[PDB]
């Protein structure tokens, strides 16, 4: 199994993509063992990015590695087609799309047309980015089997019965969970890994949870998963998408600038309370020789 | 109270706004009694539009009438501020914004900041576009009071208790329902009216229901409400957002072009089945002398 | 429209039904203008009551009035059949049942059979007690039409569209809402009335809201509705079903004993804290001359 | 890790517990590898049983094995307290209780008081029977810690992060999942086992899944889990609670009578169709030498 990072998109103070900070961040992650990079996902504020900005993220990360899954979805299908086509010249893993978001009660027939249309034009394997809470509809294993063209799926859902069902109906499909709290579980139950936003700021931990599991040292794995669980929670206190920046800078020692409002950055005091929550978990992890002093 | 139409956005074969069909459609809605027009709402596929297209829509409808509320929201706070300020030069009713959509678990603080910010730059009254199902969060009465600067609210929710609470905790606020099926109810329980996608294709009906409720002929108003509900129901089969195009062409007799994929247009078979579903209702509406044979 | 009280079941300290405190309560509710009494409802802890105890409450209230709808449902169908049958010796308004509760994902086919069985054996009209949050399923207008034998429905749901649908699909059916916070609206929109737990402790208020709406004195009907909403909100601090005992003694002046654990009574501190929250409301209610002294 | 059967309560034509069929079923289950027997659970129609019938089920199953967890809860605390005390004389594993069911929006204070009371009176370890979707409320890991006195939890939820959290915050607690579809996952991820309803009719399978996962043959374990998953799906076509009787008679060869209305038994045509849906599976299982022809 693998650990896939839905990479953060660092923005400048004046709301541009800081291509340099993106590259450092991508470089660090590859250095610390991350298998692939998922670009323009939720953790990267993909839905806040223009088609031009989505392409920029690909170009910036393509300098660092070609193990990229390139998210192109949106509510303008022509922008998504143009993006999928422009990836032809990029030797990457595949492209991805989440479902058309916002609009409730969208017909299965219409949703199927959308993903089929991305497959008919894609010059790479096509991954399904399933995130019902964010997009407001579910491409479950049955609908994915009927699309018939996905090479994998990132299932962002608390229900893991739902994630396993993809394998059951598509034995050949790569199945990833999007929950950080299930790295140990995923790795041990026969799935292909985790798209984990927590790997942005603790890639050492998510990678290590994985190893321990494949070594059938599940007891340890859970101990480590649970520490990771506390950090996940610390980030929700103030808004995990904004906390990702503070956490990555705190654990990995470089700046990722700011998010894109209405994803507002944490202020000086929110930053203090967040670090005061994880201060002790950091120490324990240097103790356990998982982080460098 | 008022009927406010969340006006459809017509698209050409080339996926561009059809300015002339928009103006044609806007005229008819004003001439058939609609009080104001909500531009770049859900029914208009607001989220699917660029900021330049959101402004395009305003410029084109202003040609016909200034009784407009201008929706400017999005996931780039800068683009919305720009849009909100550009409205200075239009003598319109207000601007509006849904809460920032897609991203879950957004802090109340971050959500209040997003709206207080728009209020801060706005040269017109600011209206709250509350659509919890489509956006993923609820700017309810307490939070709207906390925000402190809304002139009105459009509450897209089937819980009318939730809607009354706005009037209770904000006595001077205009409180509209976004539910086509409560036009009789809203009018009769002291609320300021409805924002009704259904008024796109049968503005004769939404207006008549409200009038009938004002004259306290509530029994006669429900009878027309339930006929309207059935049309609402029929449009859901193939996707209501697409079907309004068909229905508007069918009941009002001019064409509105295409929706923007992934909001796909009904096909010829789908268009024909919907009409067969509404022929019997149209008959009863002719019978009532609300429509011409 | 009508106000129907879901009458509390008074319990002694020994976990017995206090029949005399009950009769007193019924007498007062009737004397203050309540139209009918709903016995063994949620507010009278029906599901906590045995078949003998339900019948007991019917015998008890029948001593005071015959304007009684008699809930009989349960998870043992032979007990419900018996209660339905035994009601023949009582000249009441009808019987009623919620859907079988607790067990998730019950089949419409089986749910229809449950209710048709009660209709086949019922000596009186049958009322659908629809409470989806409590029973775990929904007997909407479509399933009620299919069942085909309901004289009326009590619809405990935040969604008034859902309630209107019973009228749309069942024009002859008596349609009540079970939402205290919608008494003015229900009355103003052509529905048949409310089943209002808050009429246990403030029947003066609930009846005046109804009357004001019937007179189309809408803003004054809302004024009183919004105070009532504040009492409802106060009751939720410590548990609404237990607070009803404290609130009814406070406003009506006679003590109703205790609820049945695990519906724990409020302790004396809690009782005093809840009364501190409603001293204000009560003061205004005296000023407005809806309550005495 | 263990498989615990939430044993079925078999009823006669006359709606009485068939003590003798329950003992055969009970003996069989233990003998095919079932670890513990959960009595009076959702699958046994717990909420449908009088307290006497809850004690009668214990006395019967106790004649076969002392590996019994004795669920005692209900909406009359005095009955529960007394069912707890009467278990003093049975040398069993422990008692359990779901949360008080039906009544929505109950206070965390009262829910804790409920479980603490049972702990105060219990002569055996107390198990939390957590079933959010049946009871209408959830006792999460956090609350179970507050309550403070649970030896084990049985988490009936399709969300396995929710289940793992009990072990996170309560390391000394036995944590079982209630989902038949996670037997392989639960066993390979370090949790303590499953409360599997489908082990009523295919105990061979649920125990072989478990064995396989313990043996790290995760691929062979999943293939068998996917078989079992289909049987679970087939059981829903008609009412899984009802279908379980048919399926046990089919797979195990002895009839368990009827369920209790309103849990209606399948009729003969429903029996036929259901068997046709699982005939193929019964063949695959005999092919794998898991079942004898």
UniProtKB/Swiss-Prot annotation, chains A, B, C, D:
<feature type="site" description="Proton shuttle">
    <location>
        <position position="129"/>
    </location>
</feature>
<dbReference type="InterPro" id="IPR002220">
    <property type="entry name" value="DapA-like"/>
</dbReference>
<dbReference type="InterPro" id="IPR053415">
    <property type="entry name" value="ED_pathway_aldolase"/>
</dbReference>
<keyword id="KW-0704">Schiff base</keyword>
<comment type="function">
    <text>Involved in the degradation of glucose and galactose via the Entner-Doudoroff pathway. Catalyzes the reversible cleavage of 2-keto-3-deoxy-6-phosphogluconate (KDPG) and 2-keto-3-deoxygluconate (KDG) forming pyruvate and glyceraldehyde 3-phosphate or glyceraldehyde, respectively. It is also able to catalyze the reversible cleavage of 2-keto-3-deoxy-6-phosphogalactonate (KDPGal) and 2-keto-3-deoxygalactonate (KDGal). It is equally active with both D- and L-glyceraldehyde.</text>
</comment>
<comment type="pathway">
    <text>Carbohydrate acid metabolism; 2-dehydro-3-deoxy-D-gluconate degradation; D-glyceraldehyde 3-phosphate and pyruvate from 2-dehydro-3-deoxy-D-gluconate: step 2/2.</text>
</comment>
<keyword id="KW-0119">Carbohydrate metabolism</keyword>
<feature type="active site" description="Schiff-base intermediate with substrate">
    <location>
        <position position="154"/>
    </location>
</feature>
<protein>
    <recommendedName>
        <fullName>2-dehydro-3-deoxy-phosphogluconate/2-dehydro-3-deoxy-6-phosphogalactonate aldolase</fullName>
        <ecNumber>4.1.2.55</ecNumber>
    </recommendedName>
</protein>
<comment type="similarity">
    <text>Belongs to the DapA family. KDPG aldolase subfamily.</text>
</comment>
<dbReference type="GO" id="GO:0008840">
    <property type="term" value="F:4-hydroxy-tetrahydrodipicolinate synthase activity"/>
</dbReference>
<dbReference type="GO" id="GO:0008675">
    <property type="term" value="F:2-dehydro-3-deoxy-phosphogluconate aldolase activity"/>
</dbReference>
<dbReference type="GO" id="GO:0008674">
    <property type="term" value="F:2-dehydro-3-deoxy-6-phosphogalactonate aldolase activity"/>
</dbReference>
<feature type="binding site">
    <location>
        <begin position="42"/>
        <end position="43"/>
    </location>
    <ligand>
        <name>substrate</name>
    </ligand>
</feature>
<dbReference type="Pfam" id="PF00701">
    <property type="entry name" value="DHDPS"/>
</dbReference>
<feature type="binding site">
    <location>
        <begin position="129"/>
        <end position="131"/>
    </location>
    <ligand>
        <name>substrate</name>
    </ligand>
</feature>
<keyword id="KW-0456">Lyase</keyword>
<feature type="binding site">
    <location>
        <begin position="154"/>
        <end position="156"/>
    </location>
    <ligand>
        <name>substrate</name>
    </ligand>
</feature>
<comment type="subunit">
    <text>Homotetramer; dimer of dimers.</text>
</comment>
<dbReference type="InterPro" id="IPR013785">
    <property type="entry name" value="Aldolase_TIM"/>
</dbReference>
């Amino acid at each position: 199994p693998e650990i896939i990072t839905p990479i953060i998109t660092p923005f400048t103070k004046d709301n541009r993509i800081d291509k340099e900070k993106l590259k450092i961040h991508a470089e660090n992650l590859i250095r610390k063992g991350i298998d692939k990079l998922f670009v323009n996902g939720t953790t990267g504020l993909g839905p806040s990015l223009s088609p031009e900005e989505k392409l920029e993220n690909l170009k910036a990360v393509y300098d660092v590695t070609n193990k990229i899954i390139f998210q192109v979805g949106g509510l303008n299908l022509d922008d998504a087609i143009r993006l999928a086509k422009l990836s032809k010249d990029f030797d990457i893993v595949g492209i991805a799309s989440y479902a058309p978001y916002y609009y409730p009660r969208m017909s299965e027939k219409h949703l199927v047309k959308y993903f089929k249309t991305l497959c008919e034009v894609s010059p790479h394997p096509v991954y399904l980015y399933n995130y019902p809470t964010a997009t407001g509809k579910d491409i479950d294993a049955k609908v994915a089997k009927e699309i018939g063209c996905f090479t994998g799926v990132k299932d962002v859902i608390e229900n893991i019965i739902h994630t396993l069902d993809y394998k059951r109906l598509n034995p050949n499909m790569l199945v990833y969970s999007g929950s950080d709290m299930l790295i140990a579980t995923v790795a041990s139950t026969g799935l292909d890994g985790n798209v984990a936003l927590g790997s942005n700021y603790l890639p050492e931990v998510t990678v290590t949870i994985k190893k321990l599991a494949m070594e059938r040292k599940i007891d340890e794995a859970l101990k480590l998963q649970f520490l990771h669980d506390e950090v996940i929670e610390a980030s929700r206190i103030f808004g995990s998408l904004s906390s990702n920046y503070v956490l990555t800078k705190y654990f990995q020692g470089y700046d990722l600038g700011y998010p894109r409002p209405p994803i507002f950055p944490l202020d000086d005091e929110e930053e203090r309370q967040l670090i005061k929550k994880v201060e002790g978990i950091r120490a324990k992890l240097v103790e356990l020789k998982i982080l460098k002093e």
